[PDB]
Design a protein around this ligand. Structure first.
Ligand SMILES: *[C@@H]1O[C@H](CO)[C@@H](O[C@@H]2O[C@H](CO)[C@@H](O)[C@H](O)[C@H]2NC(C)=O)[C@H](O)[C@H]1NC(C)=O
Ligand SMILES: *[C@@H]1O[C@H](CO)[C@@H](O[C@@H]2O[C@H](CO)[C@@H](O)[C@H](O)[C@H]2NC(C)=O)[C@H](O)[C@H]1NC(C)=O
Ligand SMILES: NC(=O)c1cccnc1
Ligand SMILES: NC(=O)c1cccnc1
Lengths: 250, 250
């Protein structure tokens, strides 16, 4: 295979993450059964590593699905860590990685042996290796869910120091989330184009790809707006470049 | 008992944290047994909620003890969340809550029911209820170990907006950490007295309790220094007060 092998102590981690996340859920929704969630998640783990479909994770999403505060969703591209860091375990925001079905699988990897019945710790199929692998189908399922369940003001943090462009016209946000946003429940969409401190300003609002994304969102009938280096997040990046001039306080 | 009962799903959480922490450990140190560790830790959950000594966690420490990067230790008082936050899971610094024996219990509570054998999810003997309770003893033990395995530059984060002064003469830093710092392997001690954004500036370097701390550290032969609102951390605080003037950029 060409992707990272299945995560060590996957079950241990999974159940643990799920365990801690409960305290975060509202009482009415605290009732989650992690072992049931794990048992359901495993259904895809038993199948051929190149024959897993998003729909396989339907049961898993059923037992772990839960509400997302209006105005607290945070979609993103090329900024996984920064997103996790800023959101702060649902405190500031609630990105997919901060929703039960996302938290449990964040940064992890998994797949069954190509021929054997165990877990392949050597390597898992990437997108190229074959489309229907467990990790991709999972995130396709989870992201679709996350999008349908979002509401209010939708925020999107993009990387403007990304060589190839801020908005990947072919990533999860573009292919699986935007097509699944519920217009009736969304008031407007806000984009945060974050540039690296000092880093290359490859693209800012309304430039290049950001023009495509903007045109598409508007064509769809959404209310659009874009911000460059949204201050709160700029400050966070600054935590690691305090001496740099872009991070100097008055 | 004047303290919160044992955390729900204590074992799952303990085991989950441990599992994920291994990934951060160095290769020739990554070989840890989370179940054995939990088993050792649990020895205290089989005792009288008021008859647990730091020694009882000895074996637990033996099975979890691991080296701490030089210059990476970060002691603190009155700023638990900010410390954890700024430390970023061993990325920026490595506080006791980011050491395996400290991570597995960070923010969790526990203690067995006085009479019965089961855990008490109702309450737990707080320091005043009786000194030798499960939680306190655990930390006394974890603290001493942490102080002992520290070397290089010692950073300490204190809270200058604290109503009682930045340095508590009776606290873990005071009663268990400072007393166990191996002087021979410490270059110097640096203090960060952080003030709330706009918040009350009760004390700053060289004032109030800070004079008491500074004297002891020096008298002890350490090389002392103090910084009001260390910039990196100030910027982190600023993340939640971007519009405030103390957080204004240029
Ligand atoms: C935003 O995009 C840039 C460019 O892709 C990312 O920078 C790269 O980060 C990796 C990991 O640290 C480095 O190996 C590369 O050398 C970086 N490239 C450059 C030109 O510096 C950056 O990490 C992204 N920011 C976020 C928050 O994801
Ligand atoms: C620094 O100390 C202050 C003083 O307690 C903390 O602020 C208080 O926080 C508590 C809750 O943790 C509130 O009930 C009080 O109203 C706050 N008082 C003030 C004056 O702000 C502050 O959170 C501490 N900072 C850190 C990082 O621990
Ligand atoms: N970890 C995440 O939040 C995530 C991963 C893959 C696709 N979309 C979101
Ligand atoms: N919980 C903690 O991280 C902690 C408790 C007591 C002393 N030092 C650190």
């Amino acid at each position: 295979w060409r992707a990272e092998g299945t995560s060590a102590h996957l079950r241990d981690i999974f159940l643990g993450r799920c365990a801690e996340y409960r305290a975060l859920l509202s009482p009415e929704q605290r009732n989650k059964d992690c072992t049931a969630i794990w048992e359901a998640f495993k259904v895809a783990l038993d199948k051929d590593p190149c024959s897993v479909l998003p729909s396989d994770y339907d049961l898993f999403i059923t037992l772990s699905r839960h509400s997302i505060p209006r105005d607290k969703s945070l979609f993103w591209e090329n900024s996984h860590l920064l997103v996790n860091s800023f959101a702060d375990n649902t405190r500031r925001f609630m990105p997919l990685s901060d929703v039960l079905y996302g938290r449990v699988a964040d940064f992890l990897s998994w797949c069954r042996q190509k021929a054997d019945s165990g877990l392949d710790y050597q390597s898992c199929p990437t997108s190229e290796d074959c489309e229907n692998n467990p990790v991709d189908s999972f995130w396709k399922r989870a992201s679709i869910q996350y999008s349908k369940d979002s509401s209010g003001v939708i925020h999107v943090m993009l990387n403007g120091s990304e060589p190839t462009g801020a908005y990947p016209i072919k990533g999860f946000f573009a292919d699986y989330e935007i097509p699944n946003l519920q217009k009736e429940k969304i008031t407007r969409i806000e984009i945060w184009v974050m540039h690296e401190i000092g880093g290359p300003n490859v693209e800012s609002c309304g430039e290049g790809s950001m023009k495509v994304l903007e045109k598409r969102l508007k064509d769809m009938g959404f209310q659009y707006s874009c911000i460059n280096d949204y201050r709160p997040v700029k400050l966070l990046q600054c935590v690691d470049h305090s001496t740099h001039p872009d991070c100097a306080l008055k």
